[PDB]
Design an enzyme around this catalytic site. Structure first.
Site, PDB file in Angstrom:
ATOM      1  N   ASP A   1      10.321  47.005  35.515  1.00 37.73           N
ATOM      2  CA  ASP A   1      11.240  46.929  34.570  1.00 37.73           C
ATOM      3  C   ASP A   1      10.967  48.346  34.221  1.00 37.73           C
ATOM      4  O   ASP A   1      10.533  48.981  33.854  1.00 37.73           O
ATOM      5  CB  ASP A   1      10.436  46.051  33.198  1.00 37.73           C
ATOM      6  CG  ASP A   1      11.186  46.050  32.406  1.00 37.73           C
ATOM      7  OD1 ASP A   1      11.737  46.328  32.553  1.00 37.73           O
ATOM      8  OD2 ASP A   1       9.103  45.830  30.926  1.00 37.73           O
TER       9      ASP A   1
ATOM     10  N   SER B   1      27.429  56.386  30.525  1.00 38.03           N
ATOM     11  CA  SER B   1      28.117  56.793  31.446  1.00 38.03           C
ATOM     12  C   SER B   1      29.503  57.397  30.809  1.00 38.03           C
ATOM     13  O   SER B   1      29.856  57.505  29.724  1.00 38.03           O
ATOM     14  CB  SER B   1      28.439  55.020  31.246  1.00 38.03           C
ATOM     15  OG  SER B   1      29.730  54.261  32.041  1.00 38.03           O
TER      16      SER B   1
END
Ligand SMILES: CN1C(=O)c2ccccc2[C@@H]1O
Ligand code: NA
Length: 330
Positions: A35, A199
């Site tokens: 994770d 992004s």
């Protein structure tokens, strides 16, 4: 040193991936959920409340010759999905894919929430976010990556998750055969303890690319892609009959649909998520309503590039002094 381990979907939807991990001496192999959005290595154990264990493999500290109580240390964690676990802490030898760390903090669960009990395939979590998020008190502990880092050939790990197929976690080397084209690296903020990046924008299907900054985290422990409501609405508007359902808890779509792809930007590069990756199948068994793999982040407080996005790429988690992320197509 290096390590290399295969990671395998737990089910037919790629809801999560499990990676075998050797703990203790002799080795006790547990299948952990790696994770990158958390920083605790915790396991189902012989200490876990018996009614909260249902099919998991447990770690038994006493059966390990290298297991040492980390006296006074406790831990307690809560995840974004409302799940939780807590317990006490042993140091033990931990190996992943041939890479060994001695003295790793292995957090032994005394209690786990229902979602953990109900998933027999996950024996615990191995956190790969920054060690500033580790929950051990009163002495915070390091992740497996942070403890391994000085020994590694290069201070990196890579995630190469499969679509309905196994993939690979590598530690200490970037496997230049595993991807196509070049790797585009992008800056990371560690301010919240995550692999947080920005992004450069998105496109829906064959549509034009929209240049827009989307700040989010690379999180292998989250199944879906959670993005701003504007972006998500623009995606699902291209699927006839898709709608947000407050009863179901997100966007659903007709199982008869063909989904468009979704592109996200990494600097000047582009990663394309095929439409099939965004299908999470019937909302309940036999339903003709299907659950979407792109969902709004608006009720989270962060955008999450979870497995739907990451499994479309070869992803480099660069833990050098100034961390960076890299993405390549594959
Ligand atoms: C003090 N103790 C240890 O160091 C230890 C190690 C394994 C199991 C149990 C224990 C024990 O509680
Ligand atoms: Na769900």
């Amino acid at each position: 040193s290096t390590g290399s381990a295969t990671t395998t979907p737990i089910d037919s939807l790629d809801d999560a991936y499990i990676t075998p991990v050797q703990i203790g001496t002799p080795a006790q192999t547990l299948n952990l959920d790696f994770d990158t959005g958390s920083s605790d290595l915790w396991v189902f154990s012989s200490e876990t409340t018996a009614s909260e264990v249902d099919g998991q493999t447990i770690y038994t500290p006493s059966k390990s010759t290298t297991a040492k109580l980390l006296s006074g240390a406790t831990w307690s964690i809560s995840y974004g999905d409302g799940s939780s676990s807590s317990g006490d802490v042993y140091t033990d030898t931990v190996s992943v894919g041939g890479l060994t760390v001695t003295g790793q903090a292995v957090e032994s669960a005394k209690k786990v929430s229902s979602s953990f009990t109900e998933d027999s395939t996950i024996d615990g979590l191995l956190g790969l976010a920054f060690s500033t998020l580790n929950t051990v008190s009163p002495t915070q502990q390091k992740t497996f990556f942070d403890n391994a880092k000085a020994s590694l050939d290069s201070p990196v790990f890579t995630a190469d998750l499969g679509y309905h197929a196994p993939g690979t976690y590598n530690f200490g080397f970037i496997d230049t055969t595993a991807y196509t084209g070049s790797i585009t690296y992008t800056a990371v903020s560690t301010k919240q303890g995550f692999w947080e990046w920005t992004s450069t924008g998105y496109a829906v299907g064959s549509g034009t690319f929209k240049s827009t900054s989307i700040d989010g985290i690379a999180d292998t422990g989250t199944t879906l892609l959670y993005l701003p409501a504007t972006v998500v609405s623009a995606y699902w508007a291209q699927v006839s009959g898709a709608k947000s359902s407050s009863s179901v808890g997100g966007y659903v779509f007709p199982c008869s649909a063909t989904l468009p792809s979704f592109t996200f930007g990494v600097g000047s590069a582009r990663i394309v998520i095929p439409g099939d990756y965004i299908d999470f199948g019937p909302i309940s068994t036999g339903s003709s309503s299907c659950f979407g793999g792109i969902q709004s982040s608006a009720g989270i407080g962060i955008n999450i590039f979870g497995d739907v996005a990451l499994k479309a790429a070869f992803v480099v988690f660069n833990g050098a002094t100034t961390p960076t992320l890299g993405f390549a197509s594959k």
